[model samples]
Target: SWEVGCGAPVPLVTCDEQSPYRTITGDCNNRRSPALGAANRALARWLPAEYEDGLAVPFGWTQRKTRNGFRVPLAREVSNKIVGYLDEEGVLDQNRSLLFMQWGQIVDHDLDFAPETELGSSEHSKVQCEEYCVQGDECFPIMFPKNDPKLKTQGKCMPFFRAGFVCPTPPYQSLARDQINAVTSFLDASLVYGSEPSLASRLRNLSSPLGLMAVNQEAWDHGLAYPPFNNVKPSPCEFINTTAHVPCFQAGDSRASEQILLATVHTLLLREHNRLARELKRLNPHWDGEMLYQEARKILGAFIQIITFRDYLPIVLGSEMQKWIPPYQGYNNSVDPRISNVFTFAFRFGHMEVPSTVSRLDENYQPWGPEAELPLHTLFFNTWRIIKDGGIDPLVRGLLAKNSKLMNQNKMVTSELRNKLFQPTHKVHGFDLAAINLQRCRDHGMPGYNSWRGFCGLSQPKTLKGLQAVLKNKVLAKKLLDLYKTPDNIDIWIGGNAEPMVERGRVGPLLACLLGRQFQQIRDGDRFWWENPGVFTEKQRDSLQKVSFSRLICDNTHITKVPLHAFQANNYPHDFVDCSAVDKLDLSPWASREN
Candidate 1:
């Protein structure tokens, strides 16, 4: 039986501990080089216990245990009935769109998910990614209700995924319940460094200096990079592979693929790598490709760290939570920044903002005509659209100009995601992201809403009346009570999403607490957090901080112009700016110390 462990593991020390892969300095956490730390961090994972850090349940519900002391029943039915109750049709958020989804997912790849064995095609090919869906022992398929109306002929639908750890059997129940494991990197910038040492090495060109990645200039020039393809064909980007082209490079970080935004972001990072490599080459002509590649890769990682904290987060989290984020002082070697379970689910909140349809907007920010707006239903598993639609620039501009659906906490998912997610090539009756969120939490044996409130230093709602206070109305409480029957039984995702928003914040108080803590962990625990003093010279750090997403989009893509803040819908200071007008980092600061 899988058990959630608590506190610290044995032989805990920063520089002394070791692993199969060794950093230049020989430490467990610092795997690749003297400058780069461990690709994965070691942190004490927390679990859902009966009390504050007590014996973990690891299997069944707390406070709402059944008479037989078994797991709660009908979670799928409960999730289906009440989760996404849209009072009205929909409203688009002028500031965000599928681009935001792309960014969130890409950045998420920086910090999170399953094993690398899953990425290889010999075992779990893209064709099997949905059906057989082999994601290691850590993954378990999601269970759908018998005869789902949407699946049509299904006795049950089991395509969705969860983790494989079975919660220890309840005292009364005969079967051990399935549970999940948190398979994520601890804010070490794994996306940039490489999740595994082998992949990390393969990413490097090794002919240049310290940090540069091999660039497929041919593929990128044709406006193609690593695509999320399961099967291979003779495409423009193909090389000498009798089988499918090697899974798109850099794209190894995320599961969703070939979506223009994801591929575009991958392209940007690749360009950033090559761009930095060129500058590094110019600065230090004596440096080998290996030296240059390592340096550029290190710098590129910092750029990723900066853009995430500096630009993207503010828009997604909103101004209030953003304001609360502390400046990175330096690496602490004291905090374990391992990902928390709550943080995993909280990030999924992005699903609320996903738009049903994505379109291309003109430079004037008007629709390019009906041809421009692409239905997301058709876009899944398809990459030809980027070439057919002219290029990624219009899609980039459209994401910025189009309104994203607001996260008003009323179960209103865009119909495209709820009914038509990955439909055609994926070949499913229908899918519902909202239900997945609810079901995933239960399968993980995540503690319910009230428990998290207590953990985050907030008041726990003890009754339906107490929930009225937490949830904002008697009507909302009444609706919740219809299913959960008690405050302790509510899933944290539902509770957090449903709670009223904090002032100018994207999430409610509970989620804010969780997100705030995690972001704090990300900075405080990261040895290479961009703002940390030792990671970059003050001048180099300043240059990195100055780089903007606007500049990134401009530098990498055909899009010659973008708003100062591309993540927002519109604003005076954030108005659309020509690519030339936007500020860019001066790489001269990164000139070789030997120079």
Candidate 2:
């Protein structure tokens, strides 16, 4: 009967309710719904979508007018006018370090990923999205205005591939088009260990009896351990010079090499996994490789959850939003942990904090010199810099030493990110992140700014004056109203970015609410959350609570000194502490009593 309703056979899933380890696909995290937050599932929505055609077409797809009878301004034009670069360098944050931004990205990669469609098809040889300008089934390129300052001479459009869609299933065979999140929604380290079984198997070193993840032997020979290579032919990484031979490093997340700092964090976690596994084997020699592997994996996931909730969120969400997230009572099956669509846009607030230049520090905590300092654009998709440069130590030190870019309303995004993101050395023009962010909101059919404000129980601004009162900046409200025509037509990303930051928080009120709610759902809904009763013994949970991000750096890297609070920026000699003083999780709690 079910098969007849769907016009296709629906495979039944029987979950192992007793299994201690999470399935690679995130199935059975809730016994009632096996596909709830698993890989390739449609993302959950907090509010109804606002698709222009009421189903699939993006808002403003056909140059449609808004509710106020004015066409929404082009995303690139908005970027050029509102988010233009002010100074060559950005003002630095006094309290937050670059590691603050780095950890946010690490947490983001672990939670969700929406992959794009393939470049070409097998049935008919079609022009790739990048090569052709006109819109097609898979391509929704960003059109450039006639007087576009940087891109006018280069091309008419920038290539953009639509996020892959979820397939229709069951009695609901005619649902609206929705994008897929191709990773587990839980805070489990899916980015460190692959989300799929096959990839996870490949990531492990089966040759050795020791339970350890594989590392790039070539990098090991150079005295720096790194993630294994992505052996895919015609490598995905873009090199500064065509002659360079280093390929992209393989990690659980495909976007690991999107920037150098992100890649460094991945490398650090890989080393941490191996280090844990070795200690586990030493403590319990009778356990087999699988036993050691799963145990370490479980512990690492707990470490990630703890660091995110305890270390990261407080700074980003601040006191007002933190009040909204109640203490975790316990894991409840009724809570669906699937990521919300609006939260994806909210978490991207870190984009505003990215620095234009990446600093590399020597052991003395001084700059490695001018040549060692790299422009942010040069670091994209370039694993060669990690391998050929002085390695993760300098980068990690730099993260510890440098302050993150301050979130100024006037200079929200750096020139490198706004003008040169993912730009190749030979190319004259690069993609604009500000433009893409605005475009993505419309593409996903996210409800406008006022809608989300109402959802969060805040005032829904109806006019320019109302917007100014909410944003707390009359100048910004006027500029946004000029482009959007009405408060209801403003894109969520732009409107949220324009809001003034809350007391002691990096983000404004709206972003804090969205992020706080999403994280609360992620914790309360996950059955395997670190603090849940049956998941870990009381002794183990206590040990987990003792762990900190600073100890993680000390245990894995060669660095001898670190800040007590790794995410917060502080003075060198006064705030720094020796690695020996940093607290570590006592793995003795994990040692097996059985012979």
Candidate 3:
């Protein structure tokens, strides 16, 4: 429909020329980010080295097809740079053919089915984003690439390399030690530290990457096709399950007991996060790290604040879906504009309370490598909070003040948010509903084991109590203590609780089992085999006791033992660049997705 026109009426840019790139797949090759290749090219230019000519982008970059076609061009260019880097480093063939290591993040406002109208008080971007109204032939190429000249083979991807390129046998967890070395180097150099912290930092590093990559890859591996041991396919993250809104209903039955007992105070918050992530991806056709990180942060903050609001209590406490809470009391859901005013801007987020996520770097999710990004709220308040409280438990209270300050700055009615149980500005869309309504554990295709599961904390933890040590105040600490003092019901709101792993609701045991499963995935990922021996050694028994979440998130690089797979000359992955300097460096191993 869009091959002819532009914006709503004539806003989009149309290609004057025809497309010479489309091959077998359509626009959705790697549906996650259509313009990933272009995104990478932009990143390359920003790098300190190389990119001398600055980046000569094709003017008027256009997607010729009526639908999104330039996505392929983006893919091609992305492939070029990464592959080119591997070649320049002389490891393209030596390693598992480093054609592309394309994986990043997205945001909330870009999805096809996300709730936008409800967002009344969010901190608008500094640059007032113009409303997009693209529709027809006037479509400008959404993917705008900036890449190396060496990889520009015609208007397409290099002969051997294709569009849907991925890192083969990614050197993930195996690089535990290597990752640690990198992190220590970063800290020593950046933080001005004189020397390494201790053996503990090194240990955390070893365990971190392995655990994260194993779990992440497992989510992607899907089925028994690859990493064939305990090979759980379609292993989506448990957080995703929670975010996807597992306990949604038609307003009749009680919420899940586990949610009431283990899940606790559930609003449609997770759905909000996912929708925002998908949206960010959708908006930035050529999303890079910066774009995704910023948007996701805003959405995450908004969701957390809204979820943490006071009004969202009653529905869950008394229903079968008791594990899950419904909208708060006295919350109006009427269609009338006047009645709706009560809920108007109720859930809108104040920018004062900046979110905790700077980025899901090694520290946040898998603090293994030197992949450090700024911490969100920690950056903003760490100094002021420290000075205020004499450095005793500074980040939290300071952050909370910053939050209240924000609502005042934005003129958002925090009182309404606190008083009204749920937002009046909401109109639940399909994706929001999907995330909320879909049976998460089932949808993940990995049903919950008959045990408990819990969230993890920071890696290479700064303190022994880890994230749970400071509840910001004795108030939160007392709430946590009260919950655990006797045998309180599982899933009760343990307010301000910082214990990374929740032991309630069978979570402790479930996490225990998954850890065992992940270890097997690690072993298989780093499989040792010899055909001449004829008999393979069976897996060792009781080896599971060693693995822990801390170890998984802090694998500090350096697992460099396993041999890298080399692409051959005659049938090298690259058509022309075979047997060149592009191949042979030891690369990261293919991560195990065999949870």
Q: Write the residue-wise lDDT of candidate 3 on 332-425 in tens digits.
A: 2121101010010111111111122322112112322343323332221122212222221111111111111111111211111111112111
Q: How does model 3 fare in lDDT?
A: 0.19
Best by TM-score: 2
lDDT of 2 at 259: 88
Cα-based lDDT for every prediction: 0.57, 0.80, 0.19
Off by over 4 Å in 2: 1-13, 65-68, 88-90, 119-128, 168-173, 221-224, 423-429
Show how many residue pairs clash in every candidate, following the order shown: 36, 0, 95
Model 1 Cα lDDT, one tens digit per residue, 244-321: 333333443544343555665666676777777778878877787766766676676677767677666666566555
Compared with the true structure, model 1 gives a TM-score of 0.78
Q: Pick the candidate with the highest lDDT.
A: 2
lDDT of 2 by residue, 177-224 (tens): 566787889999999998787788888889887788988987762365
In candidate 2, what residue range of length 10 has the lowest lDDT sum?
A: 1-10
Q: Which stretches of candidate 3 lie over 4 Å from their true place?
A: 1-488, 492-519, 522-595
Model 3 scores worst on lDDT over the 10 consecutive residues at 99-108
